[PDB]
Design a binder for these strands. Structure first.
Length: 168
RNA sequence: AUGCCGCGGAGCUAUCAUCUGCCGGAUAACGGCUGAACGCCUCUAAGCCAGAAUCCGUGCCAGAAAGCGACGAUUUUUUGG
């Protein structure tokens, strides 16, 4: 369990931080969640443990898995497919905020502001599918979950969601 | 002991009259995201969102008579300063 580092990646450890750099951009996360020592070998990262408890088995895994996500985020995307199921539905909003209209004919108009590093490009490749992309896996999925949650139906057709993937 | 009756300005007064009465934050229940342990799964393990007439504020009332600031003039040619 010594994950390595690809070409053109600068991993730095500083007060339990991960700040990997990449041509796609910069993406960082606070890792003040693991009480296990971190050692940087230059081309690989190793998580030594010493007589840990049961919770130590989880922590090294959680630190490891989040480590892997930063590495994929160097020069790879995190595209998510959306779905619009229906009264028809429409999306019209600019920038990193998304608005929904005619959701089951409701007069209300909702607003959804995506987290930094998550962008919508109002896809037109196919009917009823808007790609959402970015590097931060947490924010990219969090923005997508926010759109689904706010598109709620009360009392009781249901509105589902498509698959995932990578881009770039 | 306001003698009695009509009207009676002013004032007082009427849900018998008229005017005026917000939006911010943190949450509960509960629901999602990144993610494990228990090599899979799963909202939880750290964390991040969303969230009620709830709670805390801004707003409204008082203003500490022993909380405080800015500013003005400083007994007038007697006498005091």
């Amino acid at each position: 369990e010594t994950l390595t580092i690809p070409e053109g990646v600068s991993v730095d450890i500083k007060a339990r931080l991960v700040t990997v750099k990449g041509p796609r951009g910069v993406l960082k996360q606070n890792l003040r969640r693991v009480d296990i020592e971190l050692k940087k070998q230059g081309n690989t990262i190793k998580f030594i443990v010493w007589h840990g408890s049961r919770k130590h088995n989880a922590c090294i895994r959680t630190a490891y898995s989040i480590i892997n996500n930063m590495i994929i985020g160097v020069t790879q995307g995190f595209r998510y497919k959306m779905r619009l199921v229906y009264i028809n539905i429409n999306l019209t909003e600019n920038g990193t905020v998304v608005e929904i209209r005619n959701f089951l004919g409701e007069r209300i108009t909702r607003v959804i502001k995506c987290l930094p590093g998550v962008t919508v490009s109002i896809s037109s490749a196919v009917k009823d599918e808007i790609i959402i992309e970015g590097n931060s896996l947490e924010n990219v999925s969090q923005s997508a979950a926010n759109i689904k949650q706010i598109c709620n139906v009360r009392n009781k057709d249901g509105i589902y969601v498509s698959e995932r993937g990578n881009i770039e």
